[PDB]
Design an enzyme around this catalytic site. Sequence first.
Site, PDB file in Angstrom:
ATOM      1  N   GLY A  34     -10.599   3.986   1.655  1.00 26.41           N
ATOM      2  CA  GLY A  34      -9.442   4.891   1.923  1.00 26.41           C
ATOM      3  C   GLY A  34      -9.373   6.155   1.049  1.00 26.41           C
ATOM      4  N   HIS A  65       0.916  -1.202   0.000  1.00 25.09           N
ATOM      5  CA  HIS A  65       0.000   0.000   0.000  1.00 25.09           C
ATOM      6  C   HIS A  65       0.935   1.227   0.000  1.00 25.09           C
ATOM      7  CE1 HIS A  65      -1.940  -3.288   2.304  1.00 25.09           C
ATOM      8  NE2 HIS A  65      -3.041  -2.949   1.653  1.00 25.09           N
ATOM      9  N   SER A 116      -7.741   3.425  -4.412  1.00 27.80           N
ATOM     10  CA  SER A 116      -7.686   3.651  -3.004  1.00 27.80           C
ATOM     11  C   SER A 116      -7.657   2.279  -2.362  1.00 27.80           C
ATOM     12  CB  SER A 116      -8.951   4.445  -2.599  1.00 27.80           C
ATOM     13  OG  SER A 116     -10.122   3.591  -2.682  1.00 27.80           O
ATOM     14  N   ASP A 117      -7.189   2.175  -1.130  1.00 29.43           N
ATOM     15  CA  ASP A 117      -7.509   1.013  -0.350  1.00 29.43           C
ATOM     16  C   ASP A 117      -9.036   1.213  -0.044  1.00 29.43           C
ATOM     17  OD1 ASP A 117      -7.586  -1.176   1.342  1.00 29.43           O
ATOM     18  OD2 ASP A 117      -5.558  -0.762   2.166  1.00 29.43           O
ATOM     19  N   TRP A 118      -9.664   0.199   0.529  1.00 32.67           N
ATOM     20  CA  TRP A 118     -11.141   0.118   0.532  1.00 32.67           C
ATOM     21  C   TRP A 118     -11.692   1.065   1.579  1.00 32.67           C
ATOM     22  CZ3 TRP A 118      -9.400  -1.980  -3.396  1.00 32.67           C
ATOM     23  CH2 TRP A 118     -10.051  -2.860  -4.235  1.00 32.67           C
TER      24      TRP A 118
END
Lengths: 337, 844, 810
Positions: C227, C146, C223-225
């Site tokens: 995020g 990430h 994006s991360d989820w």
Amino acid sequence: SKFDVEQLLSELNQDEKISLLSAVDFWHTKKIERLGIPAVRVSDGPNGIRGTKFFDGVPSGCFPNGTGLASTFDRDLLETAGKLMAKESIAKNAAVILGPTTNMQRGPLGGRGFESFSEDPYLAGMATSSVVKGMQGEGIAATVKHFVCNDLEDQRFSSNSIVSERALREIYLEPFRLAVKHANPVCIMTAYNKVNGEHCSQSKKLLIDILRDEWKWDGMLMSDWFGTYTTAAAIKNGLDIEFPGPTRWRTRALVSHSLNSREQITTEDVDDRVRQVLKMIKFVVDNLEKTGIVENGPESTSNNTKETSDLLRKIAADSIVLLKNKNNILPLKKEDN
Amino acid sequence: SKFDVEQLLSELNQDEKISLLSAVDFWHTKKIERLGIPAVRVSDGPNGIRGTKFFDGVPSGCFPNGTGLASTFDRDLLETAGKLMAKESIAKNAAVILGPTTNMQRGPLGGRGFESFSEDPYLAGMATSSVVKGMQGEGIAATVKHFVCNDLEDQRFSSNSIVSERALREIYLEPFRLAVKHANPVCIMTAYNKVNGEHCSQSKKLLIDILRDEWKWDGMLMSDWFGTYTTAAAIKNGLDIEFPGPTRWRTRALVSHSLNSREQITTEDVDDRVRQVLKMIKFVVDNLEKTGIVENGPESTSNNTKETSDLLRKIAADSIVLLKNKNNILPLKKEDNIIVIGPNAKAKTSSGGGSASMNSYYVVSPYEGIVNKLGKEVDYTVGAYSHKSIGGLAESSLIDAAKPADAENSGLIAKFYSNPVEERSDDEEPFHVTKVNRSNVHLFDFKHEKVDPKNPYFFVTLTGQYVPQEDGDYIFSLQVYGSGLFYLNDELIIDQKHNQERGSFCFGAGTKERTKKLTLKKGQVYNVRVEYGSGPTSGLVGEFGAGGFQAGVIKAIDDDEEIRNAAELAAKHDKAVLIIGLNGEWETEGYDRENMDLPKRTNELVRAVLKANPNTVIVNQSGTPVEFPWLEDANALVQAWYGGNELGNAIADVLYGDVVPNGKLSLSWPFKLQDNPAFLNFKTEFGRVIYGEDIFVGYRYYEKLQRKVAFPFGYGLSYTTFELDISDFKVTDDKIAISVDVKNTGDKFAGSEVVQVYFSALNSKVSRPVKELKGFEKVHLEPGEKKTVNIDLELKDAISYFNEELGKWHVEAGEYLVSVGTSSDDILSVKEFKVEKELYWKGL
Amino acid sequence: SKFDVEQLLSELNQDEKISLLSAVDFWHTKKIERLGIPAVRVSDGPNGIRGTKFFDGVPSGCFPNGTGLASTFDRDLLETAGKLMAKESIAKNAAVILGPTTNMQRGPLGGRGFESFSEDPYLAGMATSSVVKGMQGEGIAATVKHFVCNDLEDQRFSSNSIVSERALREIYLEPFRLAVKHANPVCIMTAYNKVNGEHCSQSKKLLIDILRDEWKWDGMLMSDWFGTYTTAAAIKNGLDIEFPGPTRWRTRALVSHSLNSREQITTEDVDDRVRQVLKMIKFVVDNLEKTGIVENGPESTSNNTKETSDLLRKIAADSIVLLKNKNNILPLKKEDNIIVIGPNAKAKTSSGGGSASMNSYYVVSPYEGIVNKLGKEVDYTVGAYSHKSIGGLAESSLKPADAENSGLIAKFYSNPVEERSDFHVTKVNRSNVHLFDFKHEKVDYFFVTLTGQYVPQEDGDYIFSLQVYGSGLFYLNDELIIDGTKERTKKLTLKKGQVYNVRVEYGSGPTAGGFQAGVIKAIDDDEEIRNAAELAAKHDKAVLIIGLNGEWETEGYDRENMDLPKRTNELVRAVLKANPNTVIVNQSGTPVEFPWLEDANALVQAWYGGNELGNAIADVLYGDVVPNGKLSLSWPFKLQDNPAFLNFKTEFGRVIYGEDIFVGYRYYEKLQRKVAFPFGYGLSYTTFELDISDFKVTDDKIAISVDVKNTGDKFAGSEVVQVYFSALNSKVSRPVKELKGFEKVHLEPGEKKTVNIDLELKDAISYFNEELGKWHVEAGEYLVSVGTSSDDILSVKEFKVEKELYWKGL
């Protein structure tokens, strides 16, 4: 040319470099004897060359004021005016003329309205350009002034000209743009005032983003006289040389204390400024054969001839504007009472 | 008095106002005669008053260095020390003292670590506050320095201390909050460095938001010397006065041009700085009838009295920390056949280096102290040399060798010229002539009508006669800032003019040491001559100060033979007293130590002496920790610090038990440099220093890691023994009252014990140190005697942490532990308590 | 190609443009039929492909965890693993894998430390680059994640990683730099945390100045989820697509209203993000012929083959690090009389917890791998328990005994048991029912009735268990026994053979969701330790299997300490006393303290081995695979020795990276702090020796040849040649030495090979000059050190560098 910018930049020590960033007196930059760098003499102004003194000054040829000059709408005559300015400057042994002036009469009441060319940017810029071409063709450096928005006199050292980017670009920057593009002036002098909150003599937007990155102009920026307001920001943001001397803002102690304390400027910023001063000097030195300028030389009235006489009379006659002439009053007859 | 700040502000014109924002010279503010504003004299420093010059300065009383002072853990005595410093200042006619110093030893290697008080912010703050009370109760203004985070010397003028708000608040700002809260110093001096990207001397956050708006402190800020970096921002952002004069950043032209051009500052910013300078001057003038200070007055030694000697001797003896004492080596007695050995035994290491140092009335060497105590000569051998550079030339030369080694005839003659010797007419007269007693000629603040303060350009011819006291090889040396040539019998022996290399001399700004070893003949008279040019003379590129120079000589020795000799002599005595450590060239303003090692062959010498005779007492002089690699074999160990004028008598007092050792370490003493929290980030790199350990400084770090150290914060032994218990405890919702009973359980020596009170939060969700010092009391007890001491304080004072997210201090509801002991590692009595009224606060 | 990015960008209308800037659902981008733009399916994760469901997940191949994979020090094998992950992805019809992961274990306690590769940025970056090559060579898109400084789990959506530009450059950005330079990942996923004050997912410095203007990388950022944290800033500052859908920050109204009101973004910002999303779909579409990916396609177990199994087994076996082996205790012989003991012996600890884990085709326990190896029943005792919570109910619940009568049945309902007169049904095989990505027509509140029969196999006490988010009730024999929540337990006496009725009445999270009901045989803890000791004494050898599991190491929280759980240490001390010839096999993703280490004569680190974990362990223990892994991580003696000991928590919302460039072995060597086992360490069953056999430096390249030889006469084996550089006279503080090259070489007994390592000097010896903002190759003297661990340096060469270089970029 026996004058190389990069060689000399690699040979100057730090104290010498700093000493080049300010003038020594009202009218001369810093001689570096050991490297063959002469002091360069600069003189006012946009309508003829005063030389090194007001009081007791050497007599000279005064041209018509700038708004009259532009009223000729004659590029060839303005270039001729330019060349004669250079000859005038040579007689004063000034290598650099502080002109021409091209601020803008956005209103009619400006103290220096008479000194610049026109309310129209195209006419102001072609006039500037033609004057600069004539001066520089004779080997004499021009200084287009004052960059930018010095369009009134009132409290000019602090006046903040608040102006949209559209107007800045179409009206006030435009005659500088045209001058840079058509005539490549050797110098530009920064204005006293601010633009949008920042003194022009330390405005990175003006002195670097526009002049350098956008337009790629490669001449020298000098402050107007005492028109410097910080030690480090002006150095960082593109002001090549402070006038007059002796320096206020750039003593060795101030600059070198800023460098060694990592306050705002780096030795690279200092190099960038010195580099531009050396280019101006190169221009003067490479033209020394053409002009025959004498370092620290005398000032003469030697261009006081009939030929200079006749040309100032012509330029002046061509500036005159006839506004009304009803019922053939003019021209007058010699025997008219 | 009738000195009226607002009336005067209303009467000053703009030029006089600008002229108040900078010093006139190195040490004096601007006189304004038409308005009756006198010039005020300030003087260094935090361990005694030097006065107006380094070179040829008036002798003075040097106190023990700060980490020694704080190790007394004695507020009453520290306040007494501040009074004496005030009396010392009055004798130099200085109305303002430049100290105390209270930066933080986040790592042990700082060049000014000796000078400040403690890694613990409470001990540092209460020591600063006690010193300030003592000075200011006598009418003399203190200047707590350096605000803030000047915690190492490497590149200090540009060094960016990168520190979280929590650590800034709990560790670094905290001794200044405490001083401000309890003592209200008249002045504070800003640091040279940056904090989080901005120079302290122009940081609105530090100078205005915290000092003024948060804390409401109303004193005056002065820059450190040359520690000013702009014209308008320093004035806008709260810097009241620039030192030294003549001003660089605040000429009339620079400031009025800025004002007239609307560049950054307004007349209002100028008035706000001027008003704070006027308030300082009002303190001085209000106190004139009390102090008797004379404007631009003379400097005397009028305070050099038996009363001052006694008091300096006491303060130094009580600074001393006994670290080990097995097998009854100590106390020494008249009957012991002793030999005194070591590089510091006959040295006079009174103080650290730099602005804290001074010319002393006298200094009693540790050898002399012991001789004074026994009433006779004591066997001695040097053992090993540990000097960083070679001095001692002026200290052992005569003007005229054929005359007796008189006061008038001892030393050298300095003659000052406007022109160098290679150029001047033979009839050019010196403009100044001075007899020189110390080889380090330190010309930083040298002043004369022939010397331009903006370009201090001059030459010195230094002359005398040297008469060697042993046939053999001698090493002569020259160090300069500026330019120098060392002649012996008119032959050039050392060239410090050509191809100079940068070294340690002069705060690390001068040259390395160059030397010449020559074979010399006993009793033969040699003419020593130094020709010197000041900083600006020498054609080295840049802006220079006047500088200084040091010409030195030393008797070469067989170093190996001397160690063998030391060991053989030590075996033939009952006890050896080995005197070791650093000095004011190893620990000085200007640069940091490179490592924690004792110098040169010191360790080799100690190992040899401990082998030859295990009944050796070691006395170490340093301001900060040194590694003792042979520690396990050292049965008797004393840390004496740099004890000032009476250092040697104070050491003898402790060694013989006339004063029973009662100091406690003001610093953690790790086994090895690599153990320390700041091991990796104690250097300015790419212009910055990241305080990676955050709040975990000193014992806060070691306890949190459970890393054993050689000796822990707050540790110190006695000749007697003590025990204690909490005898009463009461918690309100707002206060803690704790009573502690302490008893001297020994039956031979009276002595003093230091009760240390720590707090711990038992179940917070915020990470804290294991425990934190928040109170201490020192108690003197006869054998068998018991006393109760009481420690009352507000909870807000005792158990707050700085909540960085909220921007506020926080007393958290929960369970706490009070721990009471005689070191951070020697807790003897504890008590748990509960807090349920939480509190958020800012300010004082 | 039938996919033209610029043409499409010119044809999409503004609403369609906005619809491409967020995912539709958890796993799919937006279909635009009008223009032939398909929905693209993405899937977790870095150690196997989960598919579109956690609950009722289609089984899949679980690979060893990242720190185990990196310990192979084998690029070719890592490439092979990424190719197999691609095939696993194709079988789930996922065109993009959400992996690999390459954050940095700056301390050992990171809850996702198991999931990334290495504390060393060169090993992490080459492992990353190798996995991505293998994935993308098959036409499947990698997503390196990430980005960046997501190095602990504590409060990750808000945590501010405060880190100097030098450490950011040399350690945290470096594996992404390397991955970009060598493998060109099609995607990168932004981190949840901030960096220096700014959320990564709207950081122009990270997303645009670095990734685009400096590195020229042309992939897609997601994006991360959840995020994403703003509407306009994230779009202006370079976040190409928000996941999951339905969009929160980028609805048509939010975005077009910002555009129409001159709030921060322009249509040009929007087009710039849509253009990157289209480039990603272009890679997928251009590859459809090669992959066969079906849009919105079915998910299968089609990659569950012998070929996949043998490759998973090989990758797990080569991950294993042999840490100690005195007295030739190892390899075991098949005729050794042995007992297997320990809490991990019959566990299936195939992975760590959360996003990187899955439903496996099968997992072979370490006990089963040893039974499989020996071809007969093996003596066993559990020794001690070490579970965080009680599970195991679904896994041991049901006349018939069938593998299809196996588990519990879940019957979903609209309303409560309390009120139903008298919609989805699912066969549940695992006790942890994780309903977060669960969806049905009759749901957004729903209820579950979970049923079956439990038959005890021994007489005595059993501890039944239940945890919920956030409503349920547990019934046994229709009597209430037990009332995100804590664990609540009930102990009851039962009888071997007897059938009980298990019934769990559950209510959904509003009352998303989840629950676990478990059961375990209670033991007498003291007696079971005595029993294991007694038993170990009565066998030639003991094999003791210990460690953590996916509940102690899991996404979502960090570890609180480095201890082994519960009574493990007491168990190990008792067994070592009773039998010194005990081999210990430890499973964990990150270091744990072994306080009894001095007494442990044989010790194997197995990591979390994925589906074939237990056969790989057997392969190593018996010598059918000769151990060949090296530690991808420093293994300190104690937690307090670690560089991040004091700053590994989000406090007041931040984490100060106090150790700066000094992470993992760079820290320990600099302090000269001894560790239990250093970076790069691992033993073998044979001996090797090596020498630099040629060396050549120019102005710009370094070329090194190293001869390596197996000097044993019995086992063939692989050795890992590790190449470190040191500045001997720099003006700048640096680590003692830095890994810049490695090669793995297989050697028969007596065999000798030469390996070649060529590198540009700028790759080998630059540091990041923070003041100038540039990498610098500094003139001076340097040392190359070649060895088989960061300490075991066997051959060195000094060399001079005269030509300086300042550079930025790749």
